Motif scaffolding. Structure first.
Motif, mmCIF file in Angstrom:
data_model
loop_
_atom_site.group_PDB
_atom_site.id
_atom_site.type_symbol
_atom_site.label_atom_id
_atom_site.label_comp_id
_atom_site.label_asym_id
_atom_site.label_seq_id
_atom_site.Cartn_x
_atom_site.Cartn_y
_atom_site.Cartn_z
ATOM 1 N N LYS A 174 30.622 33.748 58.596
ATOM 2 C CA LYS A 174 29.866 34.499 57.461
ATOM 3 C C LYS A 174 31.109 35.231 56.787
ATOM 4 C CE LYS A 174 28.229 37.993 58.113
ATOM 5 N NZ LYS A 174 28.458 39.619 57.926
ATOM 6 N N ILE A 175 31.809 36.070 57.784
ATOM 7 C CA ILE A 175 32.783 36.962 57.217
ATOM 8 C C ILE A 175 34.087 36.011 57.169
ATOM 9 C CG2 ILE A 175 34.141 39.118 57.289
ATOM 10 C CD1 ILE A 175 31.737 40.450 58.250
ATOM 11 N N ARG A 176 34.454 35.394 56.095
ATOM 12 C CA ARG A 176 35.617 34.573 56.222
ATOM 13 C C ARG A 176 37.204 35.525 55.951
ATOM 14 N NH1 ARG A 176 32.681 30.434 52.381
ATOM 15 N NH2 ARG A 176 31.816 32.336 51.779
ATOM 16 N N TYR A 177 37.221 36.408 55.508
ATOM 17 C CA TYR A 177 38.426 37.117 55.255
ATOM 18 C C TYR A 177 38.309 38.591 54.897
ATOM 19 C CZ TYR A 177 37.373 36.075 50.400
ATOM 20 O OH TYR A 177 36.763 35.862 49.026
ATOM 21 N N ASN A 178 39.098 39.330 55.059
ATOM 22 C CA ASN A 178 38.852 40.780 54.736
ATOM 23 C C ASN A 178 39.025 41.053 53.333
ATOM 24 O OD1 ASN A 178 38.601 43.489 55.136
ATOM 25 N ND2 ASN A 178 40.630 44.040 55.652
ATOM 26 N N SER A 179 37.920 41.165 52.655
ATOM 27 C CA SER A 179 37.948 41.484 51.121
ATOM 28 C C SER A 179 38.443 42.680 50.721
ATOM 29 C CB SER A 179 36.352 41.153 50.666
ATOM 30 O OG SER A 179 35.652 42.248 50.991
ATOM 31 N N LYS A 180 38.500 43.682 51.589
ATOM 32 C CA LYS A 180 39.175 44.962 51.080
ATOM 33 C C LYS A 180 40.633 45.139 51.475
ATOM 34 C CE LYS A 180 34.723 47.329 51.739
ATOM 35 N NZ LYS A 180 33.997 48.454 52.388
ATOM 36 N N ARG A 181 41.383 43.911 51.450
ATOM 37 C CA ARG A 181 42.890 44.144 51.814
ATOM 38 C C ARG A 181 43.543 44.472 50.455
ATOM 39 N NH1 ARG A 181 45.375 40.992 55.433
ATOM 40 N NH2 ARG A 181 47.144 42.170 54.833
ATOM 41 N N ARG A 182 44.165 45.479 50.504
ATOM 42 C CA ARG A 182 45.042 45.916 49.336
ATOM 43 C C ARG A 182 46.550 45.767 49.432
ATOM 44 N NH1 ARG A 182 47.666 50.376 50.204
ATOM 45 N NH2 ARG A 182 47.093 51.566 52.136
ATOM 46 N N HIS A 183 47.018 45.802 48.200
ATOM 47 C CA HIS A 183 48.369 45.475 48.349
ATOM 48 C C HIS A 183 49.009 46.878 47.459
ATOM 49 C CE1 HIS A 183 52.782 43.780 47.153
ATOM 50 N NE2 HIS A 183 52.566 43.645 48.465
ATOM 51 N N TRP A 184 50.206 47.136 48.025
ATOM 52 C CA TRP A 184 50.980 48.511 47.438
ATOM 53 C C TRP A 184 51.194 48.499 46.116
ATOM 54 C CZ3 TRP A 184 56.019 48.216 46.134
ATOM 55 C CH2 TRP A 184 56.816 47.116 46.571
ATOM 56 N N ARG A 185 51.381 47.025 45.552
ATOM 57 C CA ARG A 185 51.639 47.135 43.956
ATOM 58 C C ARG A 185 50.500 46.792 42.998
ATOM 59 N NH1 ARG A 185 57.544 44.296 43.301
ATOM 60 N NH2 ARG A 185 57.679 45.975 41.768
ATOM 61 N N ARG A 186 49.626 45.903 43.404
ATOM 62 C CA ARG A 186 48.677 45.412 42.580
ATOM 63 C C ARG A 186 47.338 46.550 42.410
ATOM 64 N NH1 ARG A 186 47.843 41.203 46.739
ATOM 65 N NH2 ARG A 186 45.871 41.791 48.066
ATOM 66 N N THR A 187 47.208 47.252 43.626
ATOM 67 C CA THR A 187 46.074 48.154 43.612
ATOM 68 C C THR A 187 46.777 49.525 44.194
ATOM 69 O OG1 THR A 187 44.709 46.479 43.802
ATOM 70 C CG2 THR A 187 43.877 48.774 44.388
#
Ligand SMILES: [Mg+2]
Ligand SMILES: [Mg+2]
Ligand SMILES: [Mg+2]
Ligand SMILES: [Mg+2]
Ligand SMILES: [Mg+2]
Ligand SMILES: [Mg+2]
Ligand SMILES: [Mg+2]
Ligand SMILES: [Mg+2]
Ligand SMILES: [Mg+2]
Ligand SMILES: [Mg+2]
Ligand SMILES: [Mg+2]
Ligand SMILES: [Mg+2]
Ligand SMILES: [Mg+2]
Ligand SMILES: [Mg+2]
Ligand SMILES: [Mg+2]
Ligand SMILES: [Mg+2]
Ligand SMILES: [Mg+2]
Ligand SMILES: [Mg+2]
Ligand SMILES: [Mg+2]
Ligand SMILES: [Mg+2]
Ligand SMILES: [Mg+2]
Ligand SMILES: [Mg+2]
Ligand SMILES: [Mg+2]
Ligand SMILES: [Mg+2]
Ligand SMILES: [Mg+2]
Ligand SMILES: [Mg+2]
Ligand SMILES: [Mg+2]
Ligand SMILES: [Mg+2]
Ligand SMILES: [Mg+2]
Ligand SMILES: [Mg+2]
Ligand SMILES: [Mg+2]
Ligand SMILES: [Mg+2]
Ligand SMILES: [Mg+2]
Ligand SMILES: [Mg+2]
Ligand SMILES: [Mg+2]
Ligand SMILES: [Mg+2]
Ligand SMILES: [Mg+2]
Ligand SMILES: [Mg+2]
Ligand SMILES: [Mg+2]
Ligand SMILES: [Mg+2]
Ligand SMILES: [Mg+2]
Ligand SMILES: [Mg+2]
Ligand SMILES: [Mg+2]
Ligand SMILES: [Mg+2]
Ligand SMILES: [Mg+2]
Ligand SMILES: [Mg+2]
Ligand SMILES: [Mg+2]
Ligand SMILES: [Mg+2]
Ligand SMILES: [Mg+2]
Ligand SMILES: [Mg+2]
Ligand SMILES: [Mg+2]
Ligand SMILES: [Mg+2]
Ligand SMILES: [Mg+2]
Ligand SMILES: [Mg+2]
Ligand SMILES: [Mg+2]
Ligand SMILES: [Mg+2]
Ligand SMILES: [Mg+2]
Ligand SMILES: [Mg+2]
Ligand SMILES: [Mg+2]
Ligand SMILES: [Mg+2]
Ligand SMILES: [Mg+2]
Ligand SMILES: [Mg+2]
Ligand SMILES: [Mg+2]
Ligand SMILES: [Mg+2]
Ligand SMILES: [Zn+2]
Ligand SMILES: [Zn+2]
Lengths: 91, 49, 245, 104
Positions: B33-46
RNA sequence: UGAACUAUGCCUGGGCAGGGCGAAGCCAGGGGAAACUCUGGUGGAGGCCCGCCGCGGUCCUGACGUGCAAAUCGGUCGUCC
RNA sequence: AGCAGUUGAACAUGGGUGAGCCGGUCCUAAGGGACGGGCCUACGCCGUUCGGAGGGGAGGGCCC
RNA sequence: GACGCAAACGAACCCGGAGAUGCCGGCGGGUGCCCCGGGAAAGAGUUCUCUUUUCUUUGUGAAGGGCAGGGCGCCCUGGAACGGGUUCGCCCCGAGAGAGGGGCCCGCGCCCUGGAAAGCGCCGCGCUGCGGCGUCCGGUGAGCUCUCGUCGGCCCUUGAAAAUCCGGGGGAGAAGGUGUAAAUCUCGCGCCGGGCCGUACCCAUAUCCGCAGCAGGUCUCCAAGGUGAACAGCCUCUGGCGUGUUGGAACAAGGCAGAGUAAGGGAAGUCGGCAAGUCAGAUCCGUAACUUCGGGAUAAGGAUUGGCUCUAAGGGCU
RNA sequence: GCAGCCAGCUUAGAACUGUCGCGGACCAGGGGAAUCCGACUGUUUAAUUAAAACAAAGCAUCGCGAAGGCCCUCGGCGGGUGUUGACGCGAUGUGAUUUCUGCCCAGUGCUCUGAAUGUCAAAGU
RNA sequence: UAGUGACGCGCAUGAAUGGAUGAACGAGAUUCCCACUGUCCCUACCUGCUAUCUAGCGAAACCACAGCCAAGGGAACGGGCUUGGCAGAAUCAGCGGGGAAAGAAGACCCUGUUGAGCUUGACUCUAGUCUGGCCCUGUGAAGCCUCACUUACCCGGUGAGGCGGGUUCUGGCGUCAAGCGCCCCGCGGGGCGCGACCCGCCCCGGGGACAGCGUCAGGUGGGGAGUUUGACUGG
């Protein structure tokens, strides 16, 4: 030695501010930067620090004087008036 | 900046520990049901603000 | 329209005085027993420059008569005083340049400076450089003395108003014509943010009642009534007359 | 010729970020942050422009760790007043006291 | 709700090659009966000049104009105690 | 990652920032902002070394 | 005497100092860097020819002691005109010069303790860390920086506060009665402690902001050799780098740029000398109209400029 | 009175010399005679206007002695000018210097009287 | 038809709404001359980066349907309709005639009983301000008014330090009392008084029932607020 004819000290301003204005500051800039004789030590070292502030480099005397001269004509006239006004009180 | 406050460094420490992908056994638990961590942030794009 | 420049100076955000490097408030020694029944001996320590004014200030050192201490006073430097001289302040003080004594104890025609407008206010009148006040007359019945102010106005003051004998030092400061706009920049950089004055005719009608039009004319009589509202009271406020005179 | 860098976080040529070039045992020229220059005391008279003599010219808080002999001279007003004005203070005190006996 | 842009003010900091013209002050030597003048040197003043950094942004109405860029680029240019 | 990539500031797994004498911390600069008071129907606002019975510390042994 | 001694009682209160003073110019001291001479040592480059050659390396922390060096309106003797001393400039002097002898401050320079044991350079052995040798001696400067000084210039501009620390005045007090006591600012010495927070990295033609690895924007520090007046342009060393989000092959038109060049004419082009062309540095000459006498002015207009071989002049030291 | 030694870096002059070329690259003002405007330096429409516009010194007028002038605040007789005092603060115009700046107070506006005849609120009568 | 110097009944110049002049200065506007040059006569050649071709990669604007013309008529300038000319796959590089090409519910103009910025002698108000009455506001005296009184109220000074009535011979020094008197502790110790006068009701000055506050009333008030500023009409 005689490098300028008329300007003298106001030759630093060149062709600016007008002739009559450069002539007016000339009489003042000479007296403003003049070394006056100290009436306390006798040496000719009464130079101006600021407006109305005149200091001697030998006796370290600071005198409250004029803006561009050590003493204005309005001060010697009052000092002579206050002197005679004090003489008429004791008698 | 190298000059940080304790509150800022403690705030950056929490965001640094949440930027981890989901465990592989989670997908076997919830039935994919949870396929991936949708709250992953990158230090450049966000940025964090 | 919008709030004109003249109104924005009362809020005091960028128009407050620049008082960072000023040495203090120049005022007389406050009236005490030593100045009501005698005199106090004070030594002039230094004559300093006060940023924002063209008149020097004297750091006269006095001795506290009630405690063992040395009171430092910041007087208006009268023209002629110097470091090392003794300044005497009080009722029994002698009539010498630099001394402080009531106007009632001075003869008519005495040139004074740092004159008190009311007894005890520690000097309000004749404080700018080169200015002074003359003692015109006295009145021992009413204990009032008539003096002449540097504006030509003759004010009736009390005979207990203290003043410094002499003229304020730094006279003739306005006689030197400023030549550069930079010297005027530094002149007001120490006083307040008021030097570059845009003409009201050089503005738009939104920010000044004189602005606007295809020419820079005033358009309206520059003489404005006294009861005009703030924002309209520009030009010649309550001008009794105009012209070259 | 090698180009050296600062050794602290401060990267501006302020009055506190003052250095001098020092050669190390490793034959390296490194920055050595200098202390600000101290001033010897002035005479309490307020007339003599020169500083006092016989006193270290160090920072204020360095005077705390110095001995008392290094902060004054063995005269009466030594360390606070110059010798020239002390002689004037003695002669002025004496002569004025003598004039106050003549009036009696 | 905003002065992280910008406008002004305040406080505390930082920064601005090399040259040019060369003012007061000063020195010495000539001319003169004297008044005083003349010459050389020294001196290094200035909202002074050329000009680099910097700060600006004149012209080409150049480039670009679904651009590198929702204002940029090149040369030229203004100022540079 | 505007071609590629055996490469990466990508992805994955681990590791890494050690102080009495570097800075913060201490000080007040402009300034901010309580306190007294006043104002405000009120939330509050004004004002900033002034203005209150604004000291909480003594030396000397219950006293100044 | 300036003032010096390891210390060298002392409160309330008072006085003063340091913190704590702008900008600009000249000069001087010291480091760093650069430069020159060792026919200096150790490796290395060149060696067709020439080059006793070219290149690289030749060092010492804080703190403490001592000494150069610099500064001083600090002292004593003394007395000046025939005035003298003296700076690049000045300035200084019977309120006391010159001269002589002292005193103080700064000494970031040198020597020493540190400390050569370590660091670098070279050589040797061993293995898969042990040894040897060296780390030397000078010259200078309109050289460039940094710094400490000094003398001035400028302001109708006067260029911070406070914490903290110190000196003095003060003589209230404390101490023992003949050997000590009270007291001690003695880096004389010993003993104990110094918590909390930040600390990686990027800091910009890809770690920040501009939606991005965006030719934009964004505060500072360090800064070599040659040419030259230069922190100009151009070249090189140390360091860095692959040409800035791709390669290959062609070299049409038309673009953009090279501010490419162009016979003869020389603004006839065009609204308009738009555009870029001319001029340009330096030296030696020569510079008008006008003017507020300052200027205009690098006015305008001329001549010279390389290379090589010499001559002459401009110094210091014993 | 100099001899010896040491130390640079500039300047001037001369010969010789090459294709008359030589600040050989780089760096690096075209000039002159006039008119208009603004004195100058400075400033300005970030992203079409850098100007003759703004500012400016100078000049002139106006207000005001503090129970004040000017201005702020919903308000405190709170606040700015003002740590100020007429050589000051505040409000305008003009715009360096030089040379001048004439005439008009009827209109509008400002201001000064009150031997002020009118018009004339609330309250009071 | 420019520039300059003159001429001036100047449509409609003019004296700090400043006039005239003017060295120096100016990325200001203008005219001329020398020099200079591809600005031109009159264009040519060379180089770099492109365009081009190729490997990889790979958009957007735009699009009723579409896309050869002439005349005709038509909403009066077709691409389609009429009458003619005619007409052959699929494409490349250019090109700027057309698509009344794209970009943008014309910004000019008019209309709307749609606004806004701003201005006055528009309409209607308003902050502020001026003035009067009342209010805090009492007291004494004289002829509503004037002069006094202090305690209301107000202002100023000060660390609330001497109010009322009975130290000038120098750029020193001044700090909790010496002294005397009195009294109490067991020659050491302590207190009190004088020194340093008494009394007093307000700390000291300057105003004073006036300033000023509150509240109505009149004037002023483009400083500010709100709103309006007809219609017809060969635009
Ligand atoms: Mg980013
Ligand atoms: Mg301003
Ligand atoms: Mg003005
Ligand atoms: Mg103006
Ligand atoms: Mg305008
Ligand atoms: Mg107008
Ligand atoms: Mg005008
Ligand atoms: Mg006008
Ligand atoms: Mg700012
Ligand atoms: Mg130029
Ligand atoms: Mg430049
Ligand atoms: Mg630039
Ligand atoms: Mg540009
Ligand atoms: Mg232009
Ligand atoms: Mg052009
Ligand atoms: Mg263009
Ligand atoms: Mg294009
Ligand atoms: Mg890719
Ligand atoms: Mg790999
Ligand atoms: Mg990495
Ligand atoms: Mg990652
Ligand atoms: Mg003692
Ligand atoms: Mg110096
Ligand atoms: Mg003592
Ligand atoms: Mg780091
Ligand atoms: Mg970038
Ligand atoms: Mg963003
Ligand atoms: Mg070089
Ligand atoms: Mg640099
Ligand atoms: Mg260079
Ligand atoms: Mg490549
Ligand atoms: Mg890149
Ligand atoms: Mg081509
Ligand atoms: Mg071309
Ligand atoms: Mg060309
Ligand atoms: Mg040709
Ligand atoms: Mg033509
Ligand atoms: Mg033609
Ligand atoms: Mg051109
Ligand atoms: Mg000329
Ligand atoms: Mg003319
Ligand atoms: Mg101009
Ligand atoms: Mg003019
Ligand atoms: Mg300008
Ligand atoms: Mg613009
Ligand atoms: Mg411009
Ligand atoms: Mg103008
Ligand atoms: Mg004029
Ligand atoms: Mg006028
Ligand atoms: Mg009239
Ligand atoms: Mg022509
Ligand atoms: Mg004409
Ligand atoms: Mg007219
Ligand atoms: Mg007139
Ligand atoms: Mg006119
Ligand atoms: Mg211009
Ligand atoms: Mg169609
Ligand atoms: Mg369309
Ligand atoms: Mg429409
Ligand atoms: Mg209608
Ligand atoms: Mg409307
Ligand atoms: Mg609008
Ligand atoms: Mg309106
Ligand atoms: Mg109509
Ligand atoms: Zn003197
Ligand atoms: Zn002294």
């Amino acid at each position: 030695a005689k490098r300028t004819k008329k300007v003298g000290i106001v030759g630093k301003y060149g062709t600016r501010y007008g002739a009559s204005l450069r002539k007016m500051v000339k009489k003042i800039e000479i007296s403003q930067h003049a070394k006056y004789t100290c009436s306390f030590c006798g040496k000719t070292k009464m130079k101006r620090k600021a407006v109305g502030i005149w200091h001697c480099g030998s006796c370290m005397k600071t005198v409250a004087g004029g803006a561009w001269s050590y003493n204005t004509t309005s001060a010697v006239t009052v000092k002579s008036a206050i002197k005679r006004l004090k003489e008429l009180k004791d008698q | 900046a190298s000059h940080k406050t304790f509150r800022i460094k403690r705030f950056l420490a929490k965001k640094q520990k949440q930027n981890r992908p989901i465990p592989q056994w989670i997908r076997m638990k919830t039935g994919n049901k949870i396929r991936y961590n949708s709250k992953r942030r990158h230090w450049r794009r966000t940025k964090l603000g | 329209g919008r709030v004109i420049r003249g109104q924005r100076k009362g809020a005091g955000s960028v128009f407050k005085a620049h008082v960072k490097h000023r040495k203090g408030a120049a005022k007389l020694r406050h009236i005490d027993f030593a100045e009501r029944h005698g005199y106090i001996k004070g030594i002039v320590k230094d004559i300093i420059h006060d940023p924002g004014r063209g008149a020097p200030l004297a750091k006269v050192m006095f001795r506290d008569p009630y405690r063992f201490k040395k009171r430092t006073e910041l007087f208006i430097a009268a023209e002629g005083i110097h470091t090392g001289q003794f300044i005497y302040c009080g009722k029994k003080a002698q009539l010498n340049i630099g001394n402080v004594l009531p106007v009632g104890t001075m003869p008519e025609g005495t040139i004074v400076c740092c004159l008190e407008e009311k007894p005890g206010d520690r000097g309000k009148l004749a404080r700018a450089s080169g200015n002074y006040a003359t003692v015109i007359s006295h009145n021992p019945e009413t204990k009032k003395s008539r003096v002449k102010l540097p504006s030509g106005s003759k004010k009736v003051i009390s005979s207990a108003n203290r003043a410094v004998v002499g003229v304020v030092a730094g006279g003739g400061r306005i006689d030197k014509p400023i030549l550069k706009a930079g010297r005027a920049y530094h002149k007001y950089k120490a006083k307040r943010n008021c030097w570059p004055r845009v003409r009201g005719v050089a503005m738009n009608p939104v920010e000044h009642p004189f602005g606007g039009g295809n020419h820079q004319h005033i358009g309206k009589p520059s003489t404005i009534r006294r009861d005009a509202p703030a924002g309209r009271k520009v030009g010649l406020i309550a001008a009794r007359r105009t012209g070259r005179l | 010729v090698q180009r050296l860098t600062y050794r602290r976080r401060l990267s501006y040529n302020t009055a506190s970020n003052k250095t001098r070039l020092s050669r190390t045992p490793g034959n390296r020229i490194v920055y050595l942050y200098t202390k600000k220059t101290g001033k010897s005391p002035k005479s309490a008279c307020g007339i003599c422009p020169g500083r006092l003599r016989g006193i270290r010219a160090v920072r204020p808080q360095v005077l705390m760790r110095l001995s008392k002999t290094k902060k004054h001279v063995s005269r009466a007003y030594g360390g606070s007043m110059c010798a020239k004005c002390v002689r004037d203070r003695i002669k002025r005190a004496f002569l004025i006291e003598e004039q106050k006996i003549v009036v009696k």
